[PDB]
């Protein structure tokens, strides 16, 4: 059985930690909603 609990407000935070790269990837999306890499 599933339940929900509040975790916070949805706001943009100034001076948040900035991380992660920006990759450009060729992908395919199947009928089951699964993404896969096309090479």
């Amino acid at each position: 059985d599933m339940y929900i609990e509040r975790a916070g407000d949805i706001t943009w935070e100034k001076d948040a930690e900035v991380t992660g790269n920006s990759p450009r990837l060729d992908v395919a999306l199947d009928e089951s909603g699964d993404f896969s890499l096309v090479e």
Binding site: M2, A7, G8, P23, V27, L37
Partner: protein
């Protein structure tokens, strides 16, 4: 139950203790999450029940109590924030520049941030705090890290 706007954890007591299976967004009285989090099952909010209203396995999205309300889109240029809600950890904003998933039906923004699977459904925001999509459906790259699409629904 609680219907105030905000980000929420999706929990289950079926497994050992209380386990976080995902995250969602409450906006305009409608709860938005990813299909793989609930599999379309009903939800509890205190003593109140939330029934599914719309869902689609291919989009990997589901809304409760009403139709999908989130319609903001990534502009294709600017940095965004993942409002990550990891299991047993405080909500934390992480800023990043999205990459792109190129598909036969068009390009989609993508966020290269790695979090536990129970973080699926955390919202991605623009500079005005508008939800431009949810985190949690993507691919495993050569490195072993996850790259999630910026998955957004359609406001009918």
């Amino acid at each position: 139950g609680e219907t105030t706007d905000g980000v929420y954890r999706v929990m289950t007591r079926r497994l050992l203790g209380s386990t976080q299976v995902g995250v969602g967004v409450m906006q305009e009285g409608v709860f938005h999450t990813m299909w793989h989090v609930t599999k379309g099952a009903a939800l509890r909010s205190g003593e109140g029940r939330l029934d599914p209203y719309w869902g689609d396995v291919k989009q990997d999205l589901v809304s409760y109590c009403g139709p999908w309300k989130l319609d903001a889109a990534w502009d294709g240029l600017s940095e965004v924030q993942l409002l990550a809600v990891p299991p047993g950890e405080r909500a934390k904003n992480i800023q990043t520049l999205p990459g792109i998933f190129k598909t036969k039906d068009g390009d989609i923004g993508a966020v290269a941030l790695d979090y536990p699977a129970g973080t699926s459904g955390s919202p991605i925001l623009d500079k005005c705090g508008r939800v431009i999509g949810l985190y949690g459906n993507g691919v495993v790259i050569k490195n072993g890290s996850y790259v999630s699409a910026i998955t957004q629904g359609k406001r009918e």
